[PDB]
Amino acid sequence: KAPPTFKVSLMDQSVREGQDVIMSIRVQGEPKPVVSWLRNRQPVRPDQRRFAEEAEGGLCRLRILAAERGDAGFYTCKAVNEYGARQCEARLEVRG
Amino acid sequence: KAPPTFKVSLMDQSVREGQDVIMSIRVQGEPKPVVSWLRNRQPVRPDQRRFAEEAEGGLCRLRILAAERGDAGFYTCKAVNEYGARQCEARLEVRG
């Protein structure tokens, strides 16, 4: 049993408009943490060009297809399980 | 011959995340004005879920598919021809 911890945390990025973005973390914890994503402290609502993925080894990703200036902001990854909670944050900037 | 004028101008809107947005203007002028779109004074870069359209009678539209919080901002429609320039603006807000 273990509360959530981040083995890989978010880091700032600056992309050009039209480029895809990936934000990746690696979380540990038992039971497996529930991982959710915020932009400017609001839930990230998925759509065809922005969505969350879970991969093996605790990898969790937020994918944005063809970045727009409005994607810029502060992104938070929240992790929760029965034994605690943890979060990390980074900034996405978008250039012309 | 005539400089650009707006017969129908932008107006503020507040949509829910996931809803489509249309911003419409009707421009007059001869030669036909060149119409371009800005968000927060930056060019709107088109992609599959955001693009500009021109229809008959001088109708010009900006379409956003499945609005996201980051689409919120102040949108400007710029019109230019050989005889002058005009612009109008409105705000888009996005609710959960």
Numbering used by the authors:
A (entry chain A), B (entry chain A): 17 to 112
What does the study report here?
The recently discovered Aortic Preferentially Expressed Protein-1 (APEG-1) may serve as a sensitive marker for vascular SMC differentiation. APEG-1 is expressed in differentiated vascular SMC in vivo and was found to be down-regulated rapidly in de-differentiated vascular SMC in vitro and in injured arteries in vivo. The amino acid sequence of APEG-1 (SwissProt Q15772) defines a single Ig-like domain. The structure of APEG-1 shows the intermediate set (I set) immunoglobulin superfamily fold which consists of a β-sandwich forming a central hydrophobic core.
Good quality crystals that were suitable for X-ray crystallographic studies were obtained following the truncation of the 14 N-terminal amino acids of APEG-1, a region predicted to be disordered. The X-ray structure of ΔAPEG-1 was determined and was refined to sub-atomic resolution (0.96 Å). The main hydrophobic core of the domain is formed around the aromatic residues W53, F22 and Y91. A disulfide linkage is normally present in extracellular immunoglobulin domains between strands B and F. In ΔAPEG-1 this is replaced by hydrophobic interactions between residues I41 and C93 in strands B and F, respectively. Only one cysteine of this bridge is present in ΔAPEG-1 and no disulfide linkages were found. The RGD motif folds into a 310 helix that is involved in the formation of a homodimer in the crystal which is mainly stabilized by salt bridges. The homodimer with the largest buried surface area utilizes end-to-end packing with the subunits' N-termini pointing in opposite directions. The residues involved in formation of this dimer are exclusively located within the loop cluster between strands CC', C'D and EF which lie close to the C-terminus and within the 310 helix which contains the RGD motif. The dimer interface includes two buried bi-dentate salt bridges – involving the RGD motif – between R65-D87 and R65'-D87' (the apostrophe denotes the adjacent ΔAPEG-1 molecule). An average dimer dissociation constant of Kd = 20 μM derived from the concentration-dependent Mw measurements was obtained for both full-length APEG-1 and ΔAPEG-1 at 100 mM NaCl, demonstrating the nearly identical amount of dimers.
